[PDB]
Amino acid sequence: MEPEEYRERGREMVDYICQYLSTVRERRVTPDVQPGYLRAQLPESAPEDPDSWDSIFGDIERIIMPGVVHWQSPHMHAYYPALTSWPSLLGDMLADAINCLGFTWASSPACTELEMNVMDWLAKMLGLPEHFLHHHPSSQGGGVLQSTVSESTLIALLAARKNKILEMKTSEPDADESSLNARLVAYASDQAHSSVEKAGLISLVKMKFLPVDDNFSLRGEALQKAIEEDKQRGLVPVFVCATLGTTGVCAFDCLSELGPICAREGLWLHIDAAYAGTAFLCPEFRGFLKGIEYADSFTFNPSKWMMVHFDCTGFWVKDKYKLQQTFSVNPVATDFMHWQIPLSRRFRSVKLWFVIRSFGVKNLQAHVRHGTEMAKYFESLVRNDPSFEIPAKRHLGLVVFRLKGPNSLTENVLKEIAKAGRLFLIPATIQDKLIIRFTVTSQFTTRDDILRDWNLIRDAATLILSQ
Amino acid sequence: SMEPEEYRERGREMVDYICQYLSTVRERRVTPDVQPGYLRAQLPESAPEDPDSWDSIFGDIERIIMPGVVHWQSPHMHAYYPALTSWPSLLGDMLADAINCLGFTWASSPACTELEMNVMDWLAKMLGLPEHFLHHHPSSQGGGVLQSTVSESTLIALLAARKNKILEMKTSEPDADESSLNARLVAYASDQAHSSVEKAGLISLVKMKFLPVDDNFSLRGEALQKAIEEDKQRGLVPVFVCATLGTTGVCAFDCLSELGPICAREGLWLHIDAAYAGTAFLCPEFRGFLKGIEYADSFTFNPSKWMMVHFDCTGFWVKDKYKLQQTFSVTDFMHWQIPLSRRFRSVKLWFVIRSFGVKNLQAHVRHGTEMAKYFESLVRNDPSFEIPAKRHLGLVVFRLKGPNSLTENVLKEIAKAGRLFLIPATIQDKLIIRFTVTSQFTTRDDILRDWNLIRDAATLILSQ
Ligand SMILES: *Cc1c(COP(=O)(O)O)cnc(C)c1O
Ligand SMILES: *Cc1c(COP(=O)(O)O)cnc(C)c1O
């Protein structure tokens, strides 16, 4: 295609996107396809000659959309949100056209410098300590963009185990790094995201999952007991992942208790705030952050609730030296290749910059407040209905609930709802109880959307209960 | 704040701006004249409370962003390896960014998984890869998955190799710790291998040893054979080899016909890093360097280098998907990578392959190689310069005959104007200029223009 055709096709794609995102409520959120559905609808080989743009573009509706889960539907209520926005789109359009790589400052200065200044903006927006700012005079720390919280959590564990091994190796300098690694133990809540287990599996570091209280919250007592038990057995506590907004029921570990324990015992304290971190834009949701001064690292996903399209993860460290010694064989700008697993990285900071500036802080805060109010409204509808119960507290955009009685009633409600797929729910379990997780997603979700989805859930319960 | 009708106006503005930027890019200075820290004073200290105007946001692109950008899409970009964008790549990712689905499981968005499976089978075939790397082949236990980088794909290969061997070692020592057993492992690559190989060992705590190479900077069977016997004699356990097709320094090619047989016989995971040169295997006449690919356990290259897909987009193929899965689980692609979440990267890849078609992708590789061949002829006509390694694809390496200081001062002179972007490399003692043909729009005129700036620089240095 010629540049003049790109100008026409770009317009067709902008007009397509505007219509798609505007009318998304009309779509079946979940596709009704079987595994392998696509192969028989595609040629077995790449085309030798150009396919026409009418043919490629045609295939969006004809064969892509029928297999898509519409993550931007107000009726998507599974997992946690992953929200796009107009500004996000426009910013990545620019980054993808420049298509520079920013492994070093030198390889494209703007790619590193915009990211450095925007991560300082974002740390301030979240109410993070000044020691996570690149530009605070006394700081040895800073923020860097990653693709996922999963990888940011793995990097934190990699930095914690490398740091501790280098300190152990000064005493046993004939001892293999890998042998010293055998003695380490890392902790999280039994509510922690599967990425914590997976970071242990990848790093070959022992991971212990600790019991929680009645609010599904990891407490200092449980960490202190595990540390004493594990040191008595010759293990070397190295790392704690404290979760702010667990995946299951959006619970919060008790940072004010875990912080001092991590500081006194020499454990790297990493905060996984993947979903909930966006709420810290609002001063009234910062109570969960109490104890943040003890953190060695902090991560959240703008790519969940802050209307930046995926990939966009914020990762902040107190000590960029400890991070860089993980990733370089020898220990106002920076080469971000030493703050991450790969070499290459792209100009992800444009889309984050455009979202922050297009909305401004007040409209980002209004979005968080609105989504939370939509979840509160949903909650009030459940709480009013004595057929249902709510087995965990709602703090943000996630309500969990179930029909009173055996798990099978809730199982059968989810099955009935999945038949038409007008809203997308996935089950979880908390201890013995099957629950429905209801995540408020789209920034455009209205009270009418919430009542519409509640009424479908109620119709299904009425069907299952009336037999 | 921004409304749907405003998105349609600003989307048009951005489409027109991008077309004008990519079309006029030769008029830019490829290297920006800035110093570290230049942007901080040009930006507010804090995010804006109220919305900034779209005129202000857009206006900042030229006013404060472009002055610090290295124009990777410039024909005058000749450092590192290419990273090419294209109209169809842009249009596919626009769609992917709007849907914004995540593909950790098939269930979480089937199309994200299924388009990727099918396109990776297309791309395996386009490359001339073994049928055992296809998702849909009756005998295959393998398949292709997109990754963000070759760096991460090489790390995964090594994590899969070391996990598989530790599980085999535990059968005879059930009391030994997985991390204790990892201590005995050793992994190999060429001393020309990309720094991502060294970085994989540093992350995984796997001992890496870098092997000497021959007169063509090729890793040979004998070096591997000698390393393997010496390491076994010391009580280390060979586990992995990374064979490079298209080394960073001089685009040398490891001898896979020799390394293959040894890896298979000795039970070593053989990972192929063809980051740059992979794209060349679209053209059957460059497939000589792929001879011995039937012995590979894994293979990776970047469409995000030379195939005109914008970054990120890396292909990673394994022969044994169960070995890969065992690395990451105590088709759902979350078990074929490090993270859980992943995005719909396959749209822009499908769009590029369909919008160009294979024949035009082959013409692009061949034209880039012709431009490199013309750059080569201009150097080889001029007896002030020499060429210490053979040009197989789009990289020419060359220096001034004489001490390193001559080539050094040429680079420092070219850097003053930044009219083309060149990076120093070394082989043994010799300082070299790498000359990479990048832009798919590169012409003989662009090459001669660029050569004449290197010559004009050389003329000045040679009479100081
Ligand atoms: C979503 C989530 C993650 C995983 O984030 P990715 O960016 O998908 O890796 C981890 N922890 C929590 C608490 C989450 O909600
Ligand atoms: C470019 C290059 C790499 C690194 O690729 P990324 O995708 O940037 O990690 C690795 N190996 C070789 C030979 C390369 O040319």
Side-chain angles (χ1 to χ4, degrees):
Chain A
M1 111 178 21
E2 295 291 338
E4 296 73 22
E5 303 170 69
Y6 160 79
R7 295 178 184 264
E8 297 166 336
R9 307 308 183 161
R11 288 165 153 76
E12 285 179 27
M13 184 64 68
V14 165
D15 287 349
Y16 183 80
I17 290 164
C18 185
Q19 174 79 353
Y20 170 72
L21 292 173
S22 293
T23 65
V24 74
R25 288 177 178 79
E26 296 176 2
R27 308 213 175 223
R28 195 197 155 103
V29 189
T30 36
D32 182 27
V33 285
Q34 292 318 310
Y37 76 91
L38 197 57
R39 186 181 173 187
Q41 285 160 344
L42 289 166
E44 279 284 290
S45 290
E48 285 296 304
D49 298 315
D51 288 342
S52 71
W53 193 258
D54 289 349
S55 177
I56 295 161
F57 186 81
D59 284 342
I60 298 170
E61 288 295 357
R62 208 179 48 87
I63 62 187
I64 293 337
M65 286 296 190
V68 155
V69 166
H70 303 281
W71 281 70
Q72 304 317 297
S73 178
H75 312 310
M76 173 57 150
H77 294 301
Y79 312 123
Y80 276 135
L83 295 187
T84 198
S85 65
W86 316 118
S88 191
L89 304 183
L90 291 168
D92 243 13
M93 282 167 74
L94 176 67
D96 293 346
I98 297 170
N99 189 50
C100 69
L101 305 182
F103 41 89
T104 56
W105 178 91
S107 70
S108 189
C111 182
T112 289
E113 295 220 13
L114 181 64
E115 183 163 326
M116 288 171 73
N117 284 278
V118 176
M119 294 296 288
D120 279 18
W121 279 12
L122 188 54
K124 288 181 195 198
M125 288 162 61
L126 293 171
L128 297 185
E130 290 181 320
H131 60 228
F132 286 134
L133 298 171
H134 286 279
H135 297 137
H136 191 259
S138 62
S139 182
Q140 4 224 31
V144 59
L145 293 175
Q146 304 287 343
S147 288
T148 64
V149 158
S150 295
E151 290 159 76
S152 304
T153 292
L154 172 63
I155 286 160
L157 177 59
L158 289 175
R161 77 88 164 275
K162 176 75 156 178
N163 185 63
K164 178 76 74 181
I165 291 169
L166 285 174
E167 137 192 341
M168 294 164 91
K169 270 275 268 169
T170 80
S171 262
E172 306 186 46
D174 36 23
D176 202 273
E177 290 206 326
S178 216
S179 309
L180 299 169
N181 189 72
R183 311 193 202 143
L184 300 180
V185 61
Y187 304 106
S189 167
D190 76 1
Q191 307 296 300
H193 185 260
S194 60
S195 51
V196 174
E197 187 155 48
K198 185 174 181 175
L201 174 58
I202 290 167
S203 61
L204 313 184
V205 174
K206 175 186 173 58
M207 198 61 38
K208 286 225 328 212
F209 296 99
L210 303 178
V212 292
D213 71 11
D214 289 340
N215 300 320
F216 305 104
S217 171
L218 180 60
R219 303 304 296 280
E221 295 65 25
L223 181 60
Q224 186 66 49
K225 183 212 165 142
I227 290 165
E228 298 178 11
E229 269 167 22
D230 290 330
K231 282 165 151 226
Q232 161 114 30
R233 279 157 46 186
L235 296 180
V236 175
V238 70
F239 171 100
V240 168
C241 174
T243 306
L244 306 186
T246 66
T247 300
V249 303
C250 193
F252 291 81
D253 291 341
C254 189
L255 231 193
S256 59
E257 294 174 354
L258 304 170
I261 297 174
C262 291
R264 200 136 57 214
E265 307 292 330
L267 318 202
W268 182 299
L269 173 51
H270 169 72
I271 311 301
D272 172 357
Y275 163 65
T278 290
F280 303 153
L281 265 15
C282 304
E284 68 274 16
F285 300 126
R286 283 189 187 163
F288 307 109
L289 207 45
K290 183 160 187 302
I292 186 65
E293 61 273 16
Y294 293 102
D296 295 290
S297 61
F298 178 89
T299 192
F300 93 110
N301 277 341
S303 63
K304 283 192 174 182
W305 202 18
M306 210 185 90
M307 295 182 291
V308 181
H309 69 267
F310 182 96
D311 50 317
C312 190
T313 299
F315 181 62
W316 289 261
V317 295
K318 179 152 179 176
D319 191 345
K320 95 248 288 219
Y321 172 80
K322 295 210 232 126
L323 187 58
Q324 290 175 289
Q325 82 182 357
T326 313
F327 294 129
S328 172
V329 52
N330 65 291
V332 206
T334 305
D335 299 332
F336 274 141
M337 58 188 184
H338 305 314
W339 305 47
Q340 63 178 26
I341 289 159
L343 184 72
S344 288
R345 61 191 321 272
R346 73 181 191 87
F347 199 174
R348 304 173 187 106
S349 57
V350 181
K351 71 167 163 179
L352 176 57
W353 189 51
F354 276 29
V355 168
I356 293 174
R357 295 179 65 185
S358 182
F359 284 103
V361 172
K362 290 190 269 200
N363 288 332
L364 292 179
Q365 294 175 311
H367 154 67
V368 172
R369 289 158 174 165
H370 183 73
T372 305
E373 279 205 342
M374 292 314 92
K376 276 167 88 178
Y377 179 45
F378 184 75
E379 184 189 11
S380 71
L381 294 168
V382 178
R383 185 175 303 297
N384 181 63
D385 186 325
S387 301
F388 297 83
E389 62 186 1
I390 298 165
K393 174 162 251 275
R394 174 222 61 74
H395 292 294
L396 291 176
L398 174 61
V399 177
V400 300
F401 69 102
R402 69 184 293 281
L403 280 189
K404 296 183 181 162
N407 284 334
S408 54
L409 304 168
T410 295
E411 196 185 301
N412 286 336
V413 167
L414 288 161
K415 264 142 200 68
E416 166 62 13
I417 292 160
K419 297 183 175 171
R422 295 156 63 68
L423 64 154
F424 185 22
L425 307 169
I426 301 287
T429 291
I430 3 158
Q431 315 170 73
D432 55 326
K433 278 173 273 142
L434 189 63
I435 46 165
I436 306 179
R437 288 179 79 262
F438 186 98
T439 302
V440 171
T441 60
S442 171
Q443 65 266 45
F444 296 109
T445 303
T446 70
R447 283 175 287 269
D448 286 346
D449 291 332
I450 293 301
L451 182 56
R452 181 270 208 176
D453 288 340
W454 171 244
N455 279 326
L456 293 170
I457 291 165
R458 201 345 138 170
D459 291 350
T462 299
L463 183 69
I464 275 41
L465 287 170
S466 69
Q467 179 148 22
Chain B
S1 207
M2 170 162 272
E3 290 306 334
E5 281 310 298
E6 304 171 319
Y7 162 73
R8 292 178 72 248
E9 169 192 323
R10 296 307 186 151
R12 284 157 161 74
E13 184 173 7
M14 179 65 74
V15 162
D16 289 330
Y17 177 79
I18 289 167
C19 188
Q20 188 80 357
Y21 168 77
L22 285 173
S23 302
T24 67
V25 67
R26 292 171 179 87
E27 299 166 3
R28 314 245 158 202
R29 184 199 151 114
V30 185
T31 13
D33 182 20
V34 286
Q35 307 298 309
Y38 75 90
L39 192 61
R40 184 195 168 171
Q42 298 173 340
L43 286 171
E45 297 257 87
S46 303
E49 283 292 309
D50 295 317
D52 289 337
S53 83
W54 275 92
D55 284 348
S56 188
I57 297 170
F58 260 95
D60 282 357
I61 300 165
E62 272 317 331
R63 193 182 59 84
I64 59 165
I65 299 303
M66 289 303 187
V69 158
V70 168
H71 303 274
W72 281 71
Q73 300 320 294
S74 171
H76 307 313
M77 172 56 155
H78 300 290
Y80 320 115
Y81 272 137
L84 298 187
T85 199
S86 68
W87 318 115
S89 193
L90 301 184
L91 296 161
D93 233 29
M94 279 165 75
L95 177 62
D97 291 351
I99 295 168
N100 195 41
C101 67
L102 305 175
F104 36 93
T105 62
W106 174 91
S108 66
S109 194
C112 185
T113 290
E114 287 217 24
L115 182 62
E116 192 163 318
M117 282 174 75
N118 281 282
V119 171
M120 287 303 288
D121 282 14
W122 277 17
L123 192 56
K125 289 181 181 179
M126 286 164 60
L127 282 173
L129 295 192
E131 287 183 329
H132 65 228
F133 283 129
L134 295 167
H135 289 282
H136 293 140
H137 189 84
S139 64
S140 175
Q141 308 278 291
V145 54
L146 290 176
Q147 303 285 351
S148 290
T149 63
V150 157
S151 289
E152 289 163 68
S153 303
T154 297
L155 172 60
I156 291 158
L158 176 63
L159 292 169
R162 71 90 162 274
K163 174 73 163 175
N164 186 72
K165 189 64 92 158
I166 285 156
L167 291 173
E168 188 238 319
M169 288 166 105
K170 279 223 70 152
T171 314
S172 17
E173 280 165 278
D175 301 345
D177 174 280
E178 270 204 344
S179 202
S180 296
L181 295 176
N182 187 79
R184 322 219 281 238
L185 298 187
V186 70
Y188 302 114
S190 165
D191 71 9
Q192 306 295 299
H194 183 263
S195 63
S196 63
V197 173
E198 182 167 27
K199 202 171 170 181
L202 187 77
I203 295 169
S204 58
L205 311 180
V206 176
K207 258 202 262 48
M208 275 295 180
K209 292 202 169 153
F210 294 97
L211 295 187
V213 296
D214 67 13
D215 34 294
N216 299 137
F217 307 97
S218 198
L219 178 55
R220 299 310 282 286
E222 270 282 33
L224 180 54
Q225 194 56 54
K226 186 163 181 293
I228 286 172
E229 303 174 341
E230 292 191 343
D231 283 335
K232 274 178 202 192
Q233 202 279 340
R234 246 179 305 257
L236 298 182
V237 171
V239 71
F240 177 95
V241 182
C242 179
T244 303
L245 303 181
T247 58
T248 303
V250 308
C251 196
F253 287 88
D254 287 349
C255 190
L256 198 37
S257 54
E258 293 172 357
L259 296 166
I262 299 162
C263 289
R265 193 173 39 248
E266 298 304 323
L268 319 179
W269 182 297
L270 173 57
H271 173 68
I272 315 301
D273 178 4
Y276 163 68
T279 293
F281 308 147
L282 293 183
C283 306
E285 72 272 17
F286 298 117
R287 286 185 185 161
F289 298 117
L290 211 42
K291 196 209 165 202
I293 185 67
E294 65 281 6
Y295 292 106
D297 298 292
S298 58
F299 177 98
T300 187
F301 91 109
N302 284 340
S304 68
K305 279 188 169 172
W306 202 16
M307 217 187 77
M308 297 178 288
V309 179
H310 67 265
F311 187 95
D312 50 315
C313 185
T314 294
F316 178 58
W317 285 268
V318 296
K319 180 179 212 308
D320 185 338
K321 72 161 97 89
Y322 306 109
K323 280 164 194 213
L324 186 53
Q325 188 141 34
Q326 262 177 324
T327 311
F328 289 131
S329 170
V330 50
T331 301
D332 295 331
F333 274 135
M334 63 183 174
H335 306 301
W336 300 56
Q337 56 174 32
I338 288 177
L340 181 95
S341 282
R342 68 200 310 277
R343 76 180 189 85
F344 199 175
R345 305 173 181 104
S346 56
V347 180
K348 63 185 170 168
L349 180 51
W350 189 45
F351 271 34
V352 168
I353 295 175
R354 292 182 72 181
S355 186
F356 285 99
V358 178
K359 287 197 304 176
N360 287 339
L361 292 176
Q362 289 170 317
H364 151 66
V365 165
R366 276 166 199 158
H367 176 76
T369 303
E370 280 313 294
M371 300 304 90
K373 198 162 158 78
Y374 173 45
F375 186 78
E376 183 172 4
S377 62
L378 297 167
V379 172
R380 182 181 302 294
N381 199 24
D382 189 318
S384 316
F385 303 89
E386 46 178 11
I387 300 163
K390 186 159 151 63
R391 184 209 52 74
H392 289 298
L393 296 174
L395 173 66
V396 176
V397 292
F398 70 107
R399 73 188 297 284
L400 293 178
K401 288 188 167 214
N404 286 335
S405 56
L406 288 172
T407 306
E408 196 166 44
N409 288 344
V410 171
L411 288 165
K412 279 169 170 179
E413 185 59 30
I414 296 171
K416 281 185 197 182
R419 276 292 139 188
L420 64 162
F421 183 20
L422 293 171
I423 56 120
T426 298
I427 13 155
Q428 313 132 337
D429 18 319
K430 282 151 97 58
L431 193 70
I432 53 172
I433 303 167
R434 295 175 72 260
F435 191 92
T436 304
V437 171
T438 57
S439 172
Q440 63 264 44
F441 301 100
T442 300
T443 74
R444 294 177 52 87
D445 283 344
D446 302 323
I447 293 296
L448 187 61
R449 182 271 204 173
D450 283 335
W451 169 243
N452 279 330
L453 294 173
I454 295 151
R455 208 320 130 192
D456 294 357
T459 295
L460 172 62
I461 266 46
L462 281 176
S463 23
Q464 297 179 318

